[PDB]
Amino acid sequence: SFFTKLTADELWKGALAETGAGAKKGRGKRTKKKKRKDLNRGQIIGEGRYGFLWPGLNVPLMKNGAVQTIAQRSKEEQEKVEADMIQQREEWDRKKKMKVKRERGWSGNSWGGISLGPPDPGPCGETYEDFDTRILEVRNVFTMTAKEGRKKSIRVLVAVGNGKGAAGFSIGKATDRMDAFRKAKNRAVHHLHYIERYEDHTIFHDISLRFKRTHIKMKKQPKGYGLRCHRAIITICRLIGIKDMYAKVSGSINMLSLTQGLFRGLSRQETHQQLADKKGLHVVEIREECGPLPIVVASPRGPLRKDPEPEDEVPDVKLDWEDVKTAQGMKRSVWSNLKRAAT
Amino acid sequence: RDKHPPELQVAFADCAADIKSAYESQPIRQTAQDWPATSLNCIAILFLRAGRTQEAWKMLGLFRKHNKIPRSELLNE
Amino acid sequence: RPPRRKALPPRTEKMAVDQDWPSVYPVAAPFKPSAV
């Protein structure tokens, strides 16, 4: 019956079944899902199976200065039109099948390490094109609710940085994963740290700190050493602009504790100029590649002390057994000093 | 053709601007744009007499791009 | 590329306040914003 027919919107809303107890709690999963298709997309008003040529609707109204008359395509000429529409339909399907594949993260199914692009431009014509965003953790958090039972939300941790010392991180929370991505990355650029870098490639000194239960030990390294660090530290270091560093993470490997523990340690590093000013002495760098040449890296801006720094015959500094065990060669590990891709 | 009181001259410069837009957005824009010599000289002169000198100075490039002779009156003004 | 068709200005802008309105709506017709 003609009167029992419905519109396409009604038919797709029913067929897709996006509203319902199945879609309320995700009670239904969709390895095979009905996908909405616009069936009026490639359709031309006036074109039908019979192949009639209606002047002014599907063919031009005037031809050679005269009004065209009703005509019908030949059986052969109409098959070509039908065949051409089928090919155009598979070509359109091929255009949708051709989607550019994006680079993966730390692993194929992991969100960690994936770039989210620059943060969105602020309301007052503010822009962050110089900043890159990286995901550090995407978690599904499940909240038990008084009336609705277990609900699913997303907690995301992302880090931002411009590669020139300015970097930050923020947590994002939302019911949708892409709304959380927006919140974290936009928020992160308003909580930026500035990180001091020695010669714009490494840290100024070895950093050993604990944040809660996560211990991070970082070592200053020369050029060409690369980033031999926990994968998250590698990601964060590329955003900061650190090229050469060793880091060892022990204790609880909690991504959030690691991130904020890392930023706390990198933000409290004393530069060579700060050391020179504090002690009113020259900071002299001795490099084995340059032999005995003394390279003054920093000099105090104020007066220069005349009394040498006391030379304690033996320093009362606390040592790391891992560092000492290595220096002596007693540290044997099949996993240390393994060949890895450039980082 | 001739100079007019400031009120009229301002009105003639708003019309020449809309005409300029018509020359710029012709349907023959697919092909090369044909800017007659008289049209360019008049549109430029109307901007000066209206006080929109900034727009007139910009148009001087279009005499060289299309190789159209500038009119004597335009150069003196 | 052909320019998209631009709707003309409503002909109300050409109507005088002392016109013969019965000539505009001589017979029953639906409301037309461009004509009222």
Binding site: - | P27 | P3, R5, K6
Partner: peptide, 15 residues
């Protein structure tokens, strides 16, 4: 997400 990056002039009497 990883598989696929998801996918003026007006004039009177135009001819």
């Amino acid at each position: 997400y990883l598989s696929g990056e998801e996918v003026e002039y007006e004039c009177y009497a135009p001819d």
